[PDB]
Amino acid sequence: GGFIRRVTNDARENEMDENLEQVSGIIGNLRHMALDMGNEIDTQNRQIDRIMEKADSNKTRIDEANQRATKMLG
Amino acid sequence: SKQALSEIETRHSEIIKLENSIRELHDMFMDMAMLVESQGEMIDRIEYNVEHAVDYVERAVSDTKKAVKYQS
Amino acid sequence: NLTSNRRLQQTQAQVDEVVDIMRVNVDKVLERDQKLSELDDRADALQAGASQFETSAAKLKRKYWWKNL
Amino acid sequence: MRNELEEMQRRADQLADESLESTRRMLQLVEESKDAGIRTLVMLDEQGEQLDRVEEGMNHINQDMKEAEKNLKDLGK
Ligand SMILES: [Sr+2]
Ligand SMILES: [Sr+2]
Ligand SMILES: [Sr+2]
Ligand SMILES: [Sr+2]
Ligand SMILES: [Sr+2]
């Protein structure tokens, strides 16, 4: 592959490439992980919002049903 | 004619430049990791409060029901 | 040599890209941290509210249980 | 002057060593990040499932509250 400018074609710089070979690949992974990470965050953020809307409807109805229930008690 | 040193110095500059970036990126991932891990703590709190609320609503229903039935 | 630090320059560029993606993810997770917090609250109020209706319901049932003797 | 071309040899050799080291550090650095990332996706996944259970429980309440509202009503005759 060759990630670097080779000078002393010695194995010491042969290890640099090997190393950069792996780093490059792992960055690829990191990119997709980041992308997926971002979309899950979005999707969930929206759901959370939805979840939240239902939470109100429910609490409202609950509190109201509560009011009734409370009057029928005294 | 050791211009070769020039190159080696350039490559070196490139390599440490990359390590620095891989550094920002590395911490960046550590932060997200710790951030959502922390948020998990907020989500399961929400999970139990809702589980509870569901239980209470269910109970409330069958009690209000038994109420209606006890009317006769 | 007939070899260069080109890919190294590419790798260096994608890394910085992922760095950008992750900065955006950060803003998103914080937007999430904000939302989760509100759900935490709305879930907390919800429990409280249902807890109260559970109570009303219980007493309500006890009323007619004994009203019927 | 030979004593200069001699410093350039050592200097260039030293830079390589450092460069080598730099790549060796990038390796674990990027390896750690991959682990933190997986762990995150994983955590994000199960947390996502918790939210699903949350939403469903929200739908349960919304439905159940229908009998509750009915029962109440049937009480005021
Ligand atoms: Sr930091
Ligand atoms: Sr509370
Ligand atoms: Sr209660
Ligand atoms: Sr592996
Ligand atoms: Sr989902």
Side-chain angles (χ1 to χ4, degrees):
Chain A
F3 273 83
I4 56 172
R5 291 186 183 184
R6 291 214 152 177
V7 179
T8 161
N9 235 302
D10 63 356
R12 179 177 39 155
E13 69 170 52
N14 199 58
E15 185 184 333
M16 284 187 231
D17 267 319
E18 301 279 9
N19 282 42
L20 298 168
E21 240 291 61
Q22 295 202 67
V23 178
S24 168
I26 291 171
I27 300 294
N29 302 165
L30 265 44
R31 178 173 190 277
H32 297 151
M33 267 177 225
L35 287 175
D36 289 322
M37 187 178 312
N39 296 68
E40 251 299 303
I41 306 297
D42 295 316
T43 300
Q44 295 189 351
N45 274 336
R46 291 195 295 290
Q47 174 181 30
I48 289 175
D49 272 315
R50 284 197 295 286
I51 290 174
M52 258 197 257
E53 290 205 312
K54 290 171 166 170
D56 304 304
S57 152
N58 295 339
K59 175 159 181 168
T60 297
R61 298 174 64 188
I62 284 170
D63 294 320
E64 292 194 61
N66 224 141
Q67 263 171 287
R68 290 163 174 166
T70 297
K71 284 190 180 183
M72 303 189 72
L73 266 164
Chain B
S1 75
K2 326 308 273 70
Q3 161 233 43
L5 175 83
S6 174
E7 303 191 348
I8 293 179
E9 219 147 3
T10 276
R11 183 187 57 192
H12 178 64
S13 183
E14 293 286 288
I15 293 184
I16 64 174
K17 178 65 201 70
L18 177 64
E19 186 191 300
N20 290 305
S21 290
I22 280 176
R23 282 290 174 69
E24 300 186 64
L25 186 61
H26 167 283
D27 303 1
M28 208 91 279
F29 276 101
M30 295 302 147
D31 294 322
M32 278 292 296
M34 82 131 158
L35 284 169
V36 338
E37 161 165 51
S38 107
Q39 313 199 326
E41 226 154 272
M42 179 146 50
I43 291 181
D44 39 52
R45 165 166 193 253
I46 295 178
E47 185 196 346
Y48 76 62
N49 268 156
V50 173
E51 228 295 73
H52 288 7
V54 176
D55 187 78
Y56 301 151
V57 170
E58 288 180 351
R59 297 195 229 157
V61 166
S62 44
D63 275 338
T64 299
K65 184 72 170 192
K66 295 197 207 70
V68 163
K69 289 286 123 195
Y70 295 161
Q71 256 186 177
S72 62
Chain C
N1 175 253
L2 198 239
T3 75
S4 70
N5 308 307
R6 207 160 130 300
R7 297 186 68 194
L8 175 54
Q9 288 177 295
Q10 292 174 299
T11 307
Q12 162 64 59
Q14 45 192 63
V15 177
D16 268 332
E17 167 198 23
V18 187
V19 170
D20 272 335
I21 304 181
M22 293 289 297
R23 296 195 192 185
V24 178
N25 281 329
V26 166
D27 267 300
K28 294 184 178 183
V29 109
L30 287 185
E31 174 183 25
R32 167 177 147 98
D33 193 296
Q34 181 193 184
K35 293 183 180 298
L36 281 176
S37 180
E38 304 171 300
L39 178 55
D40 203 3
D41 284 302
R42 309 207 169 202
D44 187 18
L46 183 64
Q47 177 283 343
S51 184
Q52 183 176 165
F53 181 51
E54 178 265 329
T55 291
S56 303
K59 289 302 177 64
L60 209 45
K61 170 195 67 184
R62 175 181 181 60
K63 177 169 172 280
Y64 299 86
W65 187 90
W66 288 98
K67 170 178 292 211
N68 158 287
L69 282 62
Chain D
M1 187 193 65
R2 137 219 302 178
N3 301 330
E4 217 60 301
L5 150 61
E6 264 297 3
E7 191 165 43
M8 283 174 84
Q9 305 289 43
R10 300 169 194 169
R11 164 62 164 176
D13 230 61
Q14 178 187 304
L15 285 179
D17 294 338
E18 289 185 291
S19 285
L20 211 205
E21 257 301 291
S22 190
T23 57
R24 284 174 178 175
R25 305 196 290 271
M26 283 185 252
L27 218 35
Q28 56 179 172
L29 229 34
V30 89
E31 203 70 54
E32 286 192 49
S33 313
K34 192 184 182 183
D35 289 324
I38 307 297
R39 180 169 169 265
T40 300
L41 296 183
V42 166
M43 284 191 284
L44 226 42
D45 183 67
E46 14 189 67
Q47 287 188 23
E49 286 193 347
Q50 284 185 285
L51 292 176
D52 287 339
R53 284 183 297 168
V54 163
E55 179 158 15
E56 182 169 355
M58 220 58 74
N59 293 327
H60 281 342
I61 296 186
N62 151 75
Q63 200 57 54
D64 301 353
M65 268 306 165
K66 300 204 172 186
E67 301 292 344
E69 283 147 356
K70 181 194 169 179
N71 300 328
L72 284 179
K73 179 177 298 182
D74 285 353
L75 275 192
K77 246 56 175 185

